[PDB]
Amino acid sequence: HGARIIYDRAFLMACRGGKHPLQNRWALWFFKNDKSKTWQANLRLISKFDTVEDFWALYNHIQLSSNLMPGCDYSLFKDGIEPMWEDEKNKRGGRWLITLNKQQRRSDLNRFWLETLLCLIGESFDDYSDDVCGAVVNVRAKGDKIAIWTTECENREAVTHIGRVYKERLGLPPKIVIGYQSHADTATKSGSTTKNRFVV
Amino acid sequence: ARIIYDRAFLMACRGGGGENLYFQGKHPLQNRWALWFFKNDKSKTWQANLRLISKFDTVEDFWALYNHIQLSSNLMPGCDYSLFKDGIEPMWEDEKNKRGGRWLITLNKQQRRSDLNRFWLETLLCLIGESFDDYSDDVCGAVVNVRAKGDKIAIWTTECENREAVTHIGRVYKERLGLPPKIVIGYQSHADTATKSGSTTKNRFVV
Ligand SMILES: O=C(O)C1(c2ccc(Cl)cc2)CCCC1
Ligand SMILES: O=C(O)C1(c2ccc(Cl)cc2)CCCC1
């Protein structure tokens, strides 16, 4: 009653086959592989949903048909946010980034992507869930990337809480440290690496 | 028992007043509701332009949203707003809409200034206040289409063969809008509206 709709992992999994509404409407995006065109130009909206059951029907459909889709990059964002760092809701933000080197494609990509999506749709970060914009998976030859995008890179308490809960939900050992990068820093190419604003 | 609020009570909760002590000072609604908007942005596709603005489940959260949109109102031709029960998309193909229809009010260009704002608010108050007794369960939502030629307001219901529910909703809605008995509102099946067969859609009921 003014209260946030929060779902844990077990509940979301028990809904996998009256619909259960989500706090937010979400949009799944894909980028086509056409290198004669810009990323903006290759952006496609796949579908929008705001129920747990519509989430699973979409996830199940993509998971079976993705080997046949022309490209390698998916994004899940809150309704009204484009998965581009120049969006008003992204320009001051950044991302918690998980890098998965080669072996971890076979073993970890599918499980890490799903656990990410469940954190988003289930509002797993308490009031700091409002700082979340979306998540992005980049499927590459050299190694995959999964990231949660947030709206304000100077909100250290929101960003650090998101980071801590995300790492815990991924099951990562405290030994494997994850970094938060400002989109403004990621945009500038200064060598092989981009500065971390925060680490957990 | 169903949480039912009349117009005077909902109007009394508007515009501030009191601290939400114990998180128990807000008046709960029977249903959670979602406000949707359609943008007339031709640089984007229509799936991209249909947006969920906010969800609410108390009277006071309703007014804070309504006041915010009313202040910020573009009111642009081609734009829709819709208020639907949580879990129903404002599209006739939704499982809760496909067998249904709508009670439709059409307003001419000059009625945009006189009647649009009042008719939209009275519609929203009927929805959130559960004004149709047990038949309020048949309501899905309401839609306002703002157009150059003339505006449309409609209450959407879930089942066009529930004659008694549909006729009760129609009767009460016309009364709450303050319309003269001479101005007749029609109920159209979404299945009939979808098919373009000439000059008009069949009304299956009138009040
Ligand atoms: O297995 C798939 O196809 C992946 C995917 C699943 C579901 C959704 Cl919704 C999007 C993408 C796994 C990670 C990227 C590709
Ligand atoms: O004054 C506004 O902008 C209108 C509106 C008010 C409140 C809400 Cl919640 C939605 C839309 C009045 C009719 C449609 C536009």
Residue numbers in the entry:
A (entry chain B): 9 to 25, 35 to 217
B (entry chain A): 11 to 217
Task: Quote what the paper states about this structure.
Eukaryotic initiation factor 4E (eIF4E) serves as a regulatory hub for oncogene-driven protein synthesis and is considered a promising anticancer target. The eIF4F complex includes a core of eIF4E, eIF4G and eIF4A5,6. eIF4E recognises and binds the mRNA 5’cap, and recruits eIF4G to provide a scaffold function for the eIF4F complex, while eIF4A is an RNA helicase that is stimulated by binding to eIF4E and eIF4G8. Here we screen a fragment library against eIF4E and identify a ligand-binding site with previously unknown function.
The affinity of this fragment was much weaker, Kd = 7400 µM with low ligand efficiency (LE 0.19), possibly related to the energetic penalty paid for inducing the change in protein conformation and/or inadequately filling the hydrophobic binding site.
